[model samples]
Target: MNIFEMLRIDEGLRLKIYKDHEGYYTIGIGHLLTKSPSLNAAKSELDKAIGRNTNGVITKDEAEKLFNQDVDAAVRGILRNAKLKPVYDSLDAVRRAALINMVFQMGETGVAGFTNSLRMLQQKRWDEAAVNLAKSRWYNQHPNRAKRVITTFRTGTWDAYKN
Candidate 1:
């Protein structure tokens, strides 16, 4: 129903370090080890999240702290993008949340690749934006999440995104 809710549902929570689909070490709600300077840096951040050094595990509260941090970064990333700022401002609340959800997964730079789709979204051309999603490699690889996000754009509702 919200951007954070959408991300939490889509990214899911994991308390232990695990390899993602690309075999990169990840923990919490999709915190990729690759994002850190090193594995030790990543582990240390996790330790700080829980206020203690752990033996390769995180608690749900720790996961929530990490998720909040990541989500905050995602929101800031989208807001700071030059091209997307005006477009993001043009959107309604639901669509705004949808765009933030997209940035949460793709990063602002990654989402910026959708030039045509973003134009359509900025114009409130929901169906055309949906078409762009339907035609993307993003859709091909992550159809479920893509479908939910596209559905949010097309309908301006969270019906399809409910867990």
Candidate 2:
């Protein structure tokens, strides 16, 4: 299966916005309302995908398509940002994927705001990057998720975050 299919299967399809296992408002294959532009944008995407107001309901296929669009946009954002591109391109697939995931979760601008962390990454300071990541509000707010990115950068292993 393609990466999109793999992600869809792993994230699982959901029809409506509901509290995820972590209590975040999520819908349509783990798309979080907190990060998807706005609550309105999230609902609108679901509405467009389902061809009706299914009250945020969407099919697996729609979720996969949305995931692709989201990931593509995230990648574009990373590539377009001059500060991030050089370091991002230098990363291995595992680390690159982690960075993309961070952009997806914390918008490109949000991720870019981690000046120290990004500088550490650009300097090829893996241990310092991990330390900076751990010291961020992102890490404090989402320890489990942030740690996975930290681990990937530090160890070059794409291990899933477990709470």
Candidate 3:
């Protein structure tokens, strides 16, 4: 079962972590508690959730509960930037979701504002794509969190899966 299904936090809270929330889980991301399931498991579930869509970018019903407009706006920005204008009409879903989650954490303008990463993605250079993924304003801004997310994305499996 997924952590969200395990935690029973309602569908609203689930999407927030997957596509929005700018911080690490105090209890955990989605239902996988960072402290409980082992950090690796929590991270894995988080990446998995990013790949899955429970509802729309987020339902209006869910937006109402978000305490911060910034958080909601960030999600909207992610949805918006994800469309990638005429310049980037052929963005892949995996890459787009990865960027969206990055934008979600870094705010609309923080990560989304970078032109380098967008260029890397446009070229489909996977390793450089991964490097560009690591080079986010949010990653530089919050080194630890960025490292963890990058590790998860790079390995395609979290440390919890190592055993």
Candidate 4:
């Protein structure tokens, strides 16, 4: 990968400031801030990046770039996880995409905690895997999203979510 691509993968591109794993304010490619920036500072950064005065909000193109970069990094993490790699690779494109989305939402460590779901996936028992996914707290908190994910896993189709 090129340096920019590597940076995107390693740090995860994010146009907006957000809390990192350690709860630190972070921005573009995991740029952890010692202190949160003021709205003016954020606007300046956004203007600089997009080369336009954006009323403190990033454009769709900018957001898509960040999302693409983050998704790439999340996919890499899913592929690198010892527990997930084999099962993930064994699945169809749709199922693989579903797993990637799950990893993106919860991180690889969180996805790994779905032990029974992973097991069912490894066994190719898609229905059981979907059910197992529904039983998780993640599903409880995000029933709509969980339904889409479960549908993807059960049907091996990329109808609900796509990367």
lDDT of each: 0.82, 0.72, 0.45, 0.70
The Cα error of candidate 3 at residue 33, in Å, is 23
Q: Name the weakest run of 10 consecutive residues (lDDT summed) in model 2.
A: 1-10
Better of 1 and 3 by lDDT: 1
- TM-score for model 1? 0.88
Candidate 1 lDDT by residue in tens digits, 1-163: 6777788788888889877765667888877655644667767766765678886697888788878888888878988898788789998889888888888777899998889999999888999889987898888988888998899899988898765
Q: List the residue pairs that clash in candidate 3.
A: 3-31
Query: How well is each residue in 1-163 modelled by candidate 3, as lDDT tens digits?
Result: 2222211222235433332343334222233223432445554544554444332243434333332433345456765775343213445433343444455444566765667756666665556756876656666766655664455445434342222
Q: Which ten residues in a row have the lowest lDDT in candidate 3?
A: 2-11
lDDT of 2 by residue, 27-136 (tens): 77667654444667667755765578856666777666667777798899999998778879887777787787778777889998888888888778999889878987
lDDT of 2: 0.72
Q: Give me candidate 3's TM-score against the actual structure.
A: 0.43
Please provide TM-scores, in order, for all candidate models, with all chains considered together: 0.88, 0.78, 0.43, 0.67
Ranking by lDDT: 1, 2, 4, 3
lDDT of 3 at 88: 38
Q: Provide the clash count, candidate 1.
A: 0
Off by over 4 Å in 2: 1-13, 19-25, 32-45, 49-51, 160-163
Show model 3 residue runs off by greater than 4 Å. 1-64, 67-72, 79-89, 133-137, 151-163
Q: Say which prediction, candidate 1 or candidate 2, comes out ahead on TM-score.
A: 1
